[PDB]
Design a protein around this nucleic acid. Structure first.
Ligand SMILES: [Mg+2]
Ligand SMILES: [Mg+2]
Ligand SMILES: [Zn+2]
Length: 607
DNA sequence: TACCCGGGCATAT
DNA sequence: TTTGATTCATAACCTATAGATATGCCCGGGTA
RNA sequence: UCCGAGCCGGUUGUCGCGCGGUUCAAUCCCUGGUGCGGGUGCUAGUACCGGCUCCGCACUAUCUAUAGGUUAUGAA
């Protein structure tokens, strides 16, 4: 449920023009940013230092103790036995780490709220990283060891001789995941490559469940997989493969958003005592520094401000909290329901139905029954958003200040070697002041805020153009193709699944549709035999490829060889078509057939 | 010796 | 479907996960 | 290492057409839109009334940190 919402506004409008209050928060967020940055490095340093004997069990108390030790040092006196025990163990390594990086204890007072926010956030990053990229990384390591890519290029594809290898590898995965118990003879028949992989996996001491696979164990107890995840990263570095960030590091020197609530407000901004704060209502207390009459603070859908914002010195994120919130202290069929097949009655009652074919270049390509075509290309989005313009300005500033040269020689932060990590800190410390000053410029934070405004305007203009073109009320049907997470090599990123959320915000229905073979059928003949693909060649469109002399095959242009679609006066011999146009026309036929009750056309049906 | 206040620390499921 | 032909660092664009404050107890320094 | 969108053709519901012609749209400064009135600012001929700009009435817009793939640059 949507129990919270956010309204992002500029720093100047959110806060009153009182200079004292603005300066105090700017200093406060900078201190918290420095504490958060060093805490992540200190946590990694502690793990690497103690990795010589055994991997420690990282908990919430571990990160909280590190934050207090960096701030107050030995001056921190926890009252709980559990926190006191962690303080004693982490104390010898915190002071040594500070000497290496030249860290100076800030001794910030009233840090209780900030430390709790940072401790939970860092623990969140640890859990999320383990859940998402443990099974993926473990299977990735297995493929690299067997050299699947090498065998694919050298061995003949689609042959029964190599299908056995795929079956052999597929069966080994169940043994690796402990889903199927291997036999004694099966272990003996393993090749030295297979035997070595099995021994290495068993060395990770992976948890086991009597009646559930390894994937279920990861969801149930993600934290227990952390010692194995760190050891897996060491195996990647040992064999020279591309390493991965096992431990999240907040290496960014750009001013990050810091959570500010009512307690932080009176302690650091207003600088009033807690006794005086309790005598003033929350709304009256916030009005002294923040203009609650601003449009960003207006209540929406029954949610209220409730005093919770995050700011980075240029943009202020005003959060709206529902009265029924938790007050702190704490699927396959559902996805199928988003498809147009289960949402047919909604389309019938719609004033107009618009089909969209997502593509890498033509992100949105719209067409309706009336034939009014509309498209939202990536070039149009980039110009309106200004990401390309911002990137050039950011690149120019780095070249002028020489920051790119300094950053290029920074060692890998993903390494597990203690000496290499120590060298990484020394190199980072060598020019830390130069990079900190460069990223302290307001442009870096301003670019984030300007991109948000440009993206919001681009989305608003896109909705307005579609409404003018197709009508005030319409229903959008989009192809199910989505390059989510995984992106093809040599191809830029593209927004695929985010359009579903955008249409939901604008109260516009968005229904998925299968794109299987929707670009290989000619609508005029409903045949796929005569469709021609990549028939013509031309010099590569990318400027660096064109200078090299590469030749690309056209993918967006297709033709139909059916004589019925042709005319006697034609000399080309084929009826040319646009790939985006073909998909939208095919989607219209599919949607119309489904609405009429005939279902998906048999030509577009899967095998 | 005893009381007050500001701040440090703990915890909610 | 889609559109193209090995390692590290810094920004971004995208996708996904998790979390998005307040009340009470005590203790030490100062004052009566 | 580069790019806006619309329309007319070569063209025929065709291009990463560095194909030809035409219109406005954005490069600094800006949280965005929607429905009402006013205040007069600009737009059209004698209340007809459409459009841009502010005023304020209320409905709506989910952000932060991290991880992964990719992109741009700097090093191999
Ligand atoms: Mg598509
Ligand atoms: Mg397409
Ligand atoms: Zn045909």
């Amino acid at each position: 449920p949507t129990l919270h919402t956010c309204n992002k506004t500029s720093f100047a409008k959110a806060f009153l023009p009182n200079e004292t209050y603005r300066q105090r928060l700017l200093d406060y967020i900078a201190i918290i940013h420095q504490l958060a940055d060093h805490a992540s490095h200190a946590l990694k340093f502690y793990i690497l230092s103690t990795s010589t004997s055994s991997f420690p069990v990282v908990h919430e108390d571990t990160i909280e103790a590190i934050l207090y030790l960096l701030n107050k040092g030995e001056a921190w006196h926890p009252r709980k036995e559990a926190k006191k025990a962690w303080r004693d163990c982490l104390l010898p390594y915190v002071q040594r780490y500070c000497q290496i990086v030249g860290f100076i204890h800030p001794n910030l007072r009233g840090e209780q709220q900030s430390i709790n926010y940072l401790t939970v956030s860092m623990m969140t990053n640890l859990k999320v990283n383990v859940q998402e990229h443990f099974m993926q990384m473990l299977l990735r390591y297995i493929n690299l060891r067997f050299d699947v890519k090498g065998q694919k290029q050298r061995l003949p594809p689609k042959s029964d001789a190599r299908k056995a290898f795929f079956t052999r590898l597929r069966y080994l995965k169940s043994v690796f995941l402990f889903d199927v118990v291997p036999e004694l003879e099966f272990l003996d028949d393993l090749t030295p490559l297979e035997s070595e992989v099995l021994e290495e996996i068993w060395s990770l001491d992976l948890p086991f469940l009597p009646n559930d696979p390894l994937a279920y164990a990861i969801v149930a107890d993600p934290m227990s997989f952390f010692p194995a995840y760190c050891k897996l990263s060491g195996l990647y570095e040992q064999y020279g493969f591309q390493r991965f960030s096992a431990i999240p590091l907040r290496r960014s020197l750009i001013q990050s958003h810091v959570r500010i609530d009512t307690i932080i407000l009176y302690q650091h901004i207003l600088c009033i005592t807690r006794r005086d704060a309790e005598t003033v209502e929350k709304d009256d207390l916030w009005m002294r520094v923040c203009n609650l009459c601003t449009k960003a603070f207006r209540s929406r859908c029954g949610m209220h401000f409730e005093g919770s914002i995050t700011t980075d010195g240029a943009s202020v994120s005003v959060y709206l909290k529902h009265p029924e919130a938790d007050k702190y202290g704490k699927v396959a069929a559902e996805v199928k329901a988003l498809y147009v097949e289960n949402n047919l009655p909604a389309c019938r009652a719609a004033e107009n139905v618009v089909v969209i074919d997502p593509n890498k270049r033509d992100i949105l390509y719209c067409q309706d029954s009336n034939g009014t075509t509309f498209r939202y290309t990536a070039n149009q989005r980039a110009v309106e958003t200004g990401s390309r313009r911002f990137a050039k300005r950011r690149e120019a500033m780095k070249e002028e200040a020489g920051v790119d040269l300094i950053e290029s020689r920074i060692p890998s932060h993903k390494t597990m070697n203690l000496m290499d990590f120590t060298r990484y800190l020394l190199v980072r410390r060598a020019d830390w002041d130069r990079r900190k000053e460069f990223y302290s410029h307001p442009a870096h934070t301003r670019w984030k805020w300007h991109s948000f405004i440009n993206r919001q305007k681009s989305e608003s203009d896109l909705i307005s153009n579609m409404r003018n073109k197709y009508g005030e009320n319409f229903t959008v049907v989009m192809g199910d193709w989505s390059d989510a997470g995984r992106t093809a090599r040599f191809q830029t990123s593209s927004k695929t699944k985010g359009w579903r959320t955008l249409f939901k915000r604008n109260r516009i229905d968005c229904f998925l549709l299968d794109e299987y073979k929707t670009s290989s059928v000619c609508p005029r003949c409903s045949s796929s035999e005569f469709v021609e693909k990549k028939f013509k060649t031309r010099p590569h469109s990318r400027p660096w490829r064109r200078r090299e002399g590469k030749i690309e095959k056209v993918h967006g242009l297709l033709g139909c060889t059916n004589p019925n679609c042709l005319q006697q006066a034609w000399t080309s011999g084929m009826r040319y078509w646009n790939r985006d146009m073909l998909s939208t026309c095919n989607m219209l036929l599919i949607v119309r057939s489904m609405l009429d009750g005939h279902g998906r056309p048999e030509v577009f049906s899967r095998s």
